[PDB]
Design a protein around this ligand. Structure first.
Ligand SMILES: O=c1ccn([C@@H]2O[C@H](COP(=O)(O)OP(=O)(O)O)[C@@H](O)[C@H]2O)c(=O)[nH]1
Length: 412
């Protein structure tokens, strides 16, 4: 078990968002953090590099620090055989009931947890937070002296029975279990001690920071995207259930009345995800030689800062997922003042206030209607965008995230 001590984000402090959330709120935050001044608030997880959770901590910890809370972050060390197992665990908890949990696995998992537990005494801290499966087992390698929290960043509505009965021996121990949505909260747990904490976006990260027009245009020009013509965009992983083919249909139908429209299919996927890459090849083959459709991914060098650009340069953003988690991509768009059009699924129905900040549609043709409405009425779009931005400022910002945590430490 290692510690971060540092933070890529830098010396993030509540103050760095004063301009964004206003002083009344900066205060309301500081206040709720006084009652917890000098307390120990540690975070444990499986990596400080790859991942959003990791990216969230690099900003979240510093913040907690600069507000009066001795926040600290520790990571878990392990051999490949441990992460491949946790990958399975991961995929198992998120359905895929074709996975088998063996003893060689439980032993490995539990052992790795034992070892990393003898490096730093976690029971000593006023508050301990454990992120995702990998370090769940930790909770039974110390005598509890303070509350322990389980943070879930995945779906637990339809988990592989075998695997859940095993993890549940650890999760049930913690004082409160935190989930993104009131759907991931397995029944084997006591809803009284469960907590709903949607994830959040950090306004000052590569993905959400405000770029300067010149850079947006450099990126637009680099990937051959015309900022002078209309643009619709769906940022998302490439898989069978993200509505990607529907989007392609929507773009085509819209293109009948607006021949200049361009479609941006944006998406960063890890190299160890053949599933995603096969759906990627499939997309391109369906798109055919229509270069008004841009398929942008990290294979061609698209990353957070470029994704940032594609989103900002967009006139309308889509999210036609058939099955979805929280949908941070929807959150990012909403933050960039863009009106989203998407299916009422997972976190997309929770974030979009239909008719106010964007639209919730049931099919592709309904999505076509609205893409034209919005494209036809830029001022309406501007409005929905402005409201979508506020909703985020007031609900899904990393500072509102922290405040939520505070609310939780003031209820134990
Ligand atoms: O193609 C992608 C897919 C995801 N993300 C990042 O991953 C987060 C969204 O994860 P998501 O909510 O889409 O997971 P899901 O809810 O779909 O299971 C966002 O913050 C993005 O920065 C990205 O940049 N490009």
């Amino acid at each position: 078990m290692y510690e971060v001590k540092e933070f890529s984000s830098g010396k993030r402090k509540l103050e760095d968002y004063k301009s964004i959330i206003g002083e009344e709120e900066v205060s309301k935050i500081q206040e709720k953090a006084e009652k917890l001044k000098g307390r120990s608030f540690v975070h444990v997880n499986s990596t400080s590099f790859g991942g959003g959770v990791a990216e969230i901590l690099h900003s979240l910890v510093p913040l907690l620090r600069s507000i009066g809370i001795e926040a600290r972050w520790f990571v878990i060390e392990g051999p490949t055989e441990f992460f491949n197992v946790t990958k399975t665990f991961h995929n198992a908890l998120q359905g895929n009931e074709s996975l088998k949990l063996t003893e060689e696995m439980k032993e490995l998992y539990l052992n790795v947890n034992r070892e990393n537990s003898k490096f730093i005494d976690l029971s000593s801290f006023d508050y301990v937070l454990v992120h995702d499966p990998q370090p769940a087992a930790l909770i039974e390698f110390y005598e509890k002296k303070s509350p322990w929290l389980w943070r879930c960043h995945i779906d637990l509505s339809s988990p592989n029975r075998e695997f859940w009965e095993f993890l549940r021996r650890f999760v049930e121990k913690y004082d409160r279990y935190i989930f993104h949505l009131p759907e991931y909260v397995q029944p084997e747990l006591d809803r009284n001690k469960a907590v709903i904490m949607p994830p959040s976006i950090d306004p000052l990260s590569e993905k959400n920071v405000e770029l300067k027009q010149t850079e947006i245009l450099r990126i637009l020009e680099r990937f051959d995207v015309d900022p002078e013509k209309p643009i619709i965009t769906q940022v998302s992983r490439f898989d069978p259930w993200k509505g990607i083919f529907d989007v392609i249909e929507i773009y085509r139908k819209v293109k009948e009345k607006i021949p200049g429209v361009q479609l941006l299919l944006v998406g960063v996927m890890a190299h160890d995800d053949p599933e995603g890459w096969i759906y990627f090849e499939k997309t391109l083959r369906k798109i055919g030689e229509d270069y008004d459709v841009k398929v942008l991914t990290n294979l061609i060098g698209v990353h957070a800062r470029e994704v940032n650009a594609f989103q900002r340069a967009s006139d309308v953003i889509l999210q036609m997922s058939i099955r979805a988690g929280f949908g941070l991509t929807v959150t990012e768009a909403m933050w960039k003042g863009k009106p989203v059009i998407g299916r009422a699924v997972g976190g997309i129905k929770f974030q979009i206030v239909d008719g106010e900040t964007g639209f919730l549609v049931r099919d592709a043709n309904e999505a076509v209607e609205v893409v034209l409405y919005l494209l036809k009425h830029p001022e309406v779009s501007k409005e929905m965008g402005a409201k979508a931005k506020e909703r985020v400022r007031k609900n899904f910002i990393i500072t509102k995230h922290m405040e939520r945590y505070l609310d939780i430490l003031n209820s134990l």
